[model samples]
Every structure is written in structure tokens, then in C-alpha cells.
Target: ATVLLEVPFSARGDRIPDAVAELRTREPIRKVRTITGAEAWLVSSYALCTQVLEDRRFSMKETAAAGAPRLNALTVPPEVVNNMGNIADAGLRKAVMKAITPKAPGLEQFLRDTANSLLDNLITEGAPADLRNDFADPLATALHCKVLGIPQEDGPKLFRSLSIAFMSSADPIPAAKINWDRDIEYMAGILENPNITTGLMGELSRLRKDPAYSHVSDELFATIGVTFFGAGVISTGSFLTTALISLIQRPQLRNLLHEKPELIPAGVEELLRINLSFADGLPRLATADIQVGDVLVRKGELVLVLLEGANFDPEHFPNPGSIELDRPNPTSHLAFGRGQHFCPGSALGRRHAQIGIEALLKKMPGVDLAVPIDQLVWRTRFQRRIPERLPVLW
Candidate 1:
């Protein structure tokens, strides 16, 4: 399993498809040692990936436990593990579903307003803007805060703290723990206050008063808040920025999209499928022996699904390297994952991307990169993928 190839973690999208294609054809499921010195099965094929994701034999709950097999050096306690099976408590999951479901109808409107507001602010500040800070990050932070019922003013600060806490490579469990405590404390303060009108906080408050769902306690509600902050804030921000960068790099496709704004939804699907935002899928430990493709994963062994590998598999997507905006089977992509662990905020994430990209195209029709494309720095060693900064001019 010790195969030597130049696998730079921060390689660009253009290079990723080739690497994945090579692995899929030669080693669909092979053991490879991670930089952190942990061995994992890098599942690459579409059929095998689907089988692994849907199979109950692989236990996300087990991986979340204290004594679970470690996939890397990072240690995640059971209480803080947000993996699929671990967070499957019926009562808490129902409470979370109810709180977020009601907010879905309002998502498109929120994205529209938020994107316009951020774009306006960025324009007011002048051109040659850093889309990451000036637009994408602020927009995502505000949206997450809005959903959680936190005041817009406090979003940047709360998000900054949580971002530092959960980002990959951020050290010292105590630092993350302290920030996690503060984030929950702040969320609790918001929930307890009677002033908040709507959002997750208000929904939880209302749920607690109901006889049917009164089992959900304030502490459980606060836990949900922490989970939402860590998962939603940074992920949405990174993906949105990367999608935009992808568009900037491909001008002809960007213009085609502009001409048919209705195609943006399909474009988003294509973006998610092709873009390598999440370097590796969430860790899963096998509860029972299972055969994935040609690789036999033993019980208690850790596995890492290479999302970038699965999404770009040529068998699933013909001419996978090209960004075909109108790909008929765009929804087939595993960007939000599949089965029980599929992301809860996917609808909201899509709306944000659709609104953000559409607004930028309409407002800055002539937008172009302010610097050489190759000169841009892509972030490495971080859980999420993104350009360090996206500078553009219109």
C-alpha cells in the first residue's frame, strides 16, 4: 500500500481529477498512510463509495466515542463528535430538524439580501477586493448567525472565535474547548433572552414550552447551537469562495452562466461535484468486517473517503474534468454526502451560492482577476479548501 506519487495536499482542481482518475483505475480502494501517520482506506469509486456510505456496518457512532480508533492525531470526544451515528438521538435530531425546517422557505430571501448588502459594502470600500473577507466570509457568518437568532453585530466575533476553534491544524484542545464553552455560553444567553423573535433559539424556546417536545432541555438546545456554528459557518464560507474562484478561472463558462442566470442552480450542483472544498470525508470506523471494492476493511479500522475522488470519477461523470454547467445528473454528486449523514444545511448552502454568484455577475459584469491566476495562494493544511484570498476588479 506504500505507493509513492506526488500527492500534494494543496494541489489545484486541474491536477486533482488526474490524480483521482489514476487512483480510481489503479487502486480503487487502497490503504495509504496519512501525513499524521494514520492508515486509512481511500475509497475512490462511485459504486463502492455509495456502498460504504449507506452500509450500516461502518459505524460513525463508534468513531465518535472516546476509545474509538483514531484516524489522525486529533482527538474528538463523544460529546463533541458531530458524526452521523453519534448525533442520531431521536429527540435531539427531531428538535434540530423542526427548528431548521421552518427556516428553509426564508433561505432564498436571506441569501438575496445578504449578498446584495455585502456586495454593496465591498463596492463602497473600492475595487481590488478580497472576496473571502469582504464578501464570502461575512455573508456566511451573518447567515449562520441569522439562523441561530444571534444579533448580526455579534456574528463576526462569534464566528471568528468558532472558526479558529474548529479549523484543522488549530492546536491545543484547551483552546478549542475554551472557545467551544464561550460559543455555547453566548448561545445560551441568546436563548434565555425573551427579546429574540425567531431562529433556532426562538424555535427551541417554543419547543421547550410544548407538551409534545418538552423533553428537549435548554442544555440540549445549546449543544445543537455549538454543532451548527462549527459545521455551518466555515464550510459554507469556504465552498462559496471556492465556487466563485472556479468561475473566475473559467471565463467562457462564467459568461455562459451570466447569459442564462436560470442555469445557476445546475451550475451550483456542478460546482459542488467538481470543486474539492472538503479534502477528505468525515472519519468512519468499521463496526464489522466489510469488503469495499477490492479492499477488505476489518472491524474497528478507520476509513477516509476521498470525496474529491468519488465526485470526479469518469465512470459517474463523463468528461469529468470539464465543468459542464448543465450536466443532466448534477444532483448525483456527493458534495453534501449521501444517506443518513447528508448535510442538514444543504438547502441553505445552495441558496447562498446561487444568490452570491448571481449577484456578483449582475453587479460586476466585467469582474476579472486582479493578479495572475497562478500567483494566487491556495490554503493548505486546513480542514476546508479555499484560496487564501480572492482578489478581483470590475
Candidate 2:
């Protein structure tokens, strides 16, 4: 019997632990024990992990099956009822997708302008500020509320419902099914509001009349609302905050982005690759026997694909540590998960960071950590790598 390395080998701040690099180099494919006391194969090889993701045989549906290998103990109920787990192709995804990737004009400008207004207020407050609270957090919240057509006044109330869903996932207290039950009730109220037709949620309201999801339960509508509110706020906020931290660590690149504004988009892509916002790859369950490179994964086994490991796989990327703004294909990183589970908000997230960073580069010509890099605080125990507070001086 082969001994297995433990999940989450080691993490020191935002740096990828040296243990993961060694694992990817020596034991690209190996069985490992999960934090949840289940056995699973940890695929560290870039090619192999990408293969598992693209393979149709491996299903995201069995995530909570009896023998599934979970990283955490909690089993939160789904925010979206008709997802890839059961629904082969959920037409309901199309409705919200269109809202995010809007068919009409002014969406990008709306995001860009929102970034500007938030920065203006932050600048008014003066320099040497905590960008996380003053800038990234509220900016993300405002854009999320505005884009979804959620009333700004209702942001806290909406986030509270989504927070319960997140709280259930983050901890073991386990009240998910019912709090989301309450959540459904609240969002049902939003949907039943006959005169509200402004944001993406309004579009979702109109889309409900279509044959595809006309009869979707009010519970489903609430789940959709939760998804829109949650994904729009937390994920975007974390990504932008980390992106700024990555920039703060490297002062020289600030000028590069400002001087060559065309590089902002590519630079943002590299930031996505290097940022510690997303740690592990989205987990999956195998439906059929499949060979990944030299290893054969049998059916019913759990697969934990390490995104950070795959991103730095020396075989695929020549030098994976340093940010390369001009890499031939800067967007190749698996920061966003693969296949059907690909992030719905990825496009908007990218634009937000690009424009937000560009606006930052323009406003603050010199930006770096106000405190020593050694003093930076980061979240380690939970799934994502998030900074507690981003202290900076401009």
C-alpha cells in the first residue's frame, strides 16, 4: 500500500507552498486522504487535471454522494436546483448568463463608471487607505446590485439570505436547507413585485415567461436570485482585492500597465493566474473508467484537481511563478474551473479587474504596501486564499 500526502500540504501567506511544487514534480498523480476522512486521487499534473475536467465521464453531480471525498464536513443545499448535477443542460443558466453577458450596450461602461465613482470617493478620503473595505468591497457590492437590478437599499437583506447559504457551507452548524427555504421566501417576494423591471433579475423575471423555465418552482427562482447576488458580490470582490495585492507586491509593473495601457487586459489575465483568490480546483466524481495520462482512475473514486498545482505545472508553463503579462496565451490558466461548471461571471469579473486596475494605475501612479510584506494577513483554513485587509499607500 502506498502512503498518501495530506490535502492542503502547506500554505504561507499568498505564496504557493514549496510542498505543492515538489508534489507536482515528483508525484504528479497520487492517492491522497481528504480533510473529510475520505480517500481520493489528487491529480497535480496540468494535462491530467485538464483531461479529467474535459472528460464527459467524470460528473459534477455526485459531489454529495454517500462515498464522495469532501474537503469540508458541511453539505449545503444547492442555490440553483437545476444544475449540471442533475439537469444535463439547464436552460435556466441561459437566463442569468444573458444578464451577466448582456446582449445590449453600456454594461461594460456601467462597470467602468461604477469603478470610477467608487475610486473617487476613496480618493476623497485620502491616501494610505485599506483598499479592501473602502474600494474593492463596496465597488463590487454596488456593481452587483446595479447589474442584477437589485435595489441598492436591499443589498444587506439579499446578502443576508445568501450569507446563510454560505455560512452553512463554511461551517458544520448545518441549517442550509431551511435558511435557503427562508431565502426562497424572500426572493419570491422580489419576483412577485410586478413593477420591478430594471436589473438582470428583471430580465430573469421576463425570461420566466419562456417555455423552458416557465413552470420552474418559486424555490428555483430564489436559488437563481441567491446565485446572482452571491456570485456577483463575494467572488468579484475577492478577485479584485487579490489582483490589487499582486500589483502592490510588484511596483515596477504598475508603470508598465500605466504606460502601456493596452497591456491592462493581458496583465489582468496574469493577475488571475497568480492571484491566491481561488485555491483548489472544483471537485468532481468519476462516472466511468478513464485513463488520465499514465494513471487509470476507476469509477466511484473522488478526484481533487489542484488548480494552483496545475497552473504551475512545469511541463505546461515554462516559468509558472512570476507573473507574465505577455505570455502567448495569457488566459490559459484554470483560475476558472473547466467545462459545464465554468464560472458564469468570468467575463464580467475580467472586465471589472481590467478597468478597475487601469483606473487605479491612472489615479495612483505609485502604489505599494504601506506595511511590510511580512505583516500581510491571509485566510488559510477555508477553501479560498483571501487577504484580511489590503493596506496600501499611494
Candidate 3:
């Protein structure tokens, strides 16, 4: 008998592994072993992915169910897995969502200004700059601080926790718990600190005192701040970092975008569509008997949605590998996921890339890799696919 192919065929975001295409054609929904030594259905095609995501029976929350197969061990508390649902339960979903919107007053301008400032510093510092550490991550950290109503100076401290917090491991990470608890303390402090009076945290602080929300636990409030900040920073930083690689690799596309800045949003959409930042398949626990492709996904089974599998499916996208700005169905990709658990920070994430790329093109139109492509190291054993350090020359 053949050994089950381990999922996450490759962690490099620069290129999709050839095996993904083979799976899409030969076995769109096939069984695979996860890092935890448990088997799951790796759904590859767009239609099947959309079906599993749209159907609530394939549960995100249940992926955290005790003794179930796991994509990776939980970095946060098991209950924290359903963060958005908990936010909704606490009746702060609307406020939380509104605070994260890129349309918030001055938010877009802030993103633009932050991106430009970082680029200017990089220019001042000279070539062979590490974009991931010096630019992309700092910008993400700053943006989340601004959005969270926390002092920008405090961002790096919290940001440090993420490398441990976002790890995708077969076993629980001790450092993750340590950082989680510490970050939780910091967030809890923010809730009561009267001096903090703006952005999401400030709003949440005010609500914490309201009689209507008196029943909501302080743990929930603290969790929101920690989770949102970590998730946002990690996601946007990794995405913008990789998107820069994509842009730099395709000079003509980069030059086209440089020449016509108006195409940035569309470009950002395509970048989102092709992003390989998610290193693991999105996990869900099946709630009922479901026929996905040829496999019967029984209740209580684990299902892993391969985002790149769907995004690159030629059946849905005629030329899946090419980044055509004019693709008929551009935003249909499941980058931020779909249905119930779709990322609430989608707008913020998109804007972060758009503004970062816009400022980058205008500032350093000649950006290119400082070293050979194959020489760059890709991060592994982590949630997002990113270069350890994106060294670039202008």
C-alpha cells in the first residue's frame, strides 16, 4: 500500500508546486496526512473548495474539537479558535468590523504615509535592504497599533510574540503559551488604561464599561486585541512581503503598475488571488456525511481546503499561473477564505498591499532581488509562506 502524501507539498510562496496541478487533475479531493499524523481530505478544485467553505456543516470551530485531527496545535486557547463568533456573541462584531475598515477616517492616508516613510528610510540606508524585517513587518506592526489604539512604540514588543504564536507544529509550542499569556496581560491593561482613547481598543474599552456589555468577560476583550493584532500583522506583513517578490520578479508588470498607478487595486486583487502565504490547508471538521468529488467525507472527519489548489485551478481560471489584471472573475479567489469565517480584515489587508506597492513603485521603481532567486530562504514550519529576509536592491 502507498504511504499517504503529506500535505503542504511546498512552503515556497514564489512558485506553486507542480504536484498541486497533478492533484487537481488526477485527484481533486484526495486523502493526505497532516503534520499531526492524522489523515484529512485535501480539497483542491475551486468548486469543491467553495462547496466545503460555503456549507456550515464543515465546521471551522470544530477543528478545535478535542482529540480531532489538527492542522497544527492551537497557539491560543481552544475557545479562542472561534474568535469572530465570540466577538459576535459579545455583540461587538459590528464595532470590531467597522474599526478595521480601510475606509475609517484617515486610515488609508495613514497606510500611505507609513509605507512612504519606510521606503524613504530604506532609501536613506542604501541598497541590499531587508524588506521583510525593515519595511513590510514594521509597516504591518505600525498599522495594527494605529488600528488597535495602542502606542506605536509598543508594537515591536507585541510583534515579537507572533513568530512563536503563528507556528504550525505537530506538538504544542511552550513558547506560544508564554507569549500568549504575556500578550493577553498587555491587552488587558489597554482595556483599563484611560489614556488610550481612540481606534478599536479605545472603543472596546468604552464598551467594556457599558452596562449592556457587562456580561462579556474581560478575557474576551483581551483576546480580541491580541488575536486581531497578531493575525493582522502576520497576514499583511507576509502578504506584502511576498507580493513585493512577485512584483519584483515580473519587472514588466511592476513597470506597468509603476506607469499606471490606477491599476494598483486590480493588481492587488490578482496578488491576493495568487498569494501562497497560507502554508497549511484551511482546516474544518465535517459535521455530516458529505460527498466531495468522489470521496465520502463522513461526519467528524477532518477536511483541509487547499487555497492555492482552488486559486490556481485552470478550470476556473483559464491561465491560472499568469497574473492578468483583466481576468473576468478576479476577486473570486479564496485568499481570505469564504462564507462564515472569511477574514474580517480583508479590506485592511488589501489596502495595506495597495498602498505599500503604490508607495514602493513611486519611491523605488527599480527594486529587484539583491541575491539569486534560489539563494533566498523560504520560511517553513510556520503559517505563512515568506522569505526569511527579502533583501532587495534599487
Across residues 268-384, which tens digit of lDDT does each residue of candidate 1 receive?
888888878885556688988898887789988877777877788888999886888667788998888887688888887887788889999987777788988777776665567
Query: Model 3 lDDT vs. the true structure?
Result: 0.94
Report lDDT per candidate: 0.74, 0.71, 0.94
lDDT of model 1 at position 185: 86
RMSD of every prediction = 2.6, 2.9, 0.8
Judging by lDDT against the true structure, name the best candidate. 3
Looking at model 3, report the run of 10 residues with the lowest lDDT sum: 102-111
Residue-level error in angstroms, candidate 2, position 156: 3.7
Better of 1 and 2 by lDDT: 1
Question: Please, what are the lDDT tens digits per residue for candidate 3 over residues 9-128?
Answer: 987889999999999999999999999899999999999999999999999999999988888888989999989999999999999999998887898889889889999999999998
- Per-residue accuracy of model 2 over 83-115 as CA lDDT, tens digit each: 533222445655567677633477677767777
